[PDB]
Amino acid sequence: EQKIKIYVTKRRFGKLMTIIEGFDTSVIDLKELAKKLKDICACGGTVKDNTIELQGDHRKKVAEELVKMGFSRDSIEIR
């Protein structure tokens, strides 16, 4: 059971980020995923530990792209 969580966060003194977590890092390369997602959202981003952080609110965009890429619709939750 892979469980993908997509949500928005704003750290203290920060700007709104979109966070994506729950991928199996031994099978999925987050660096390449992030690069692909950054093109979809046209924003900056990085792999932060075992998560991807994107600048701005792109929850729906990301979720839809992940489905396009073959990830289960039912494995993804937007919060």
Side-chain angles (χ1 to χ4, degrees), residues 8-19 53-57:
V8 115
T9 228
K10 178 190 160 170
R11 303 187 212 120
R12 193 196 173 86
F13 307 130
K15 268 209 165 198
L16 200 76
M17 301 284 99
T18 296
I19 315 292
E53 301 193 344
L54 300 179
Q55 319 202 272
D57 175 3

Side-chain angles (χ1 to χ4, degrees), residues 24-72:
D24 184 340
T25 207
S26 77
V27 178
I28 294 134
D29 182 279
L30 291 182
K31 315 177 170 192
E32 188 67 28
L33 190 50
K35 175 159 128 174
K36 282 172 151 40
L37 292 185
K38 283 203 278 178
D39 194 63
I40 269 76
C41 74
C43 60
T46 45
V47 172
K48 228 266 218 128
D49 294 287
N50 278 330
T51 76
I52 297 167
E53 301 193 344
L54 300 179
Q55 319 202 272
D57 175 3
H58 312 280
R59 291 126 90 198
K60 298 190 200 186
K61 244 184 259 67
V62 172
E64 295 294 351
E65 184 65 25
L66 293 178
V67 173
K68 191 176 303 179
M69 300 181 166
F71 298 107
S72 188

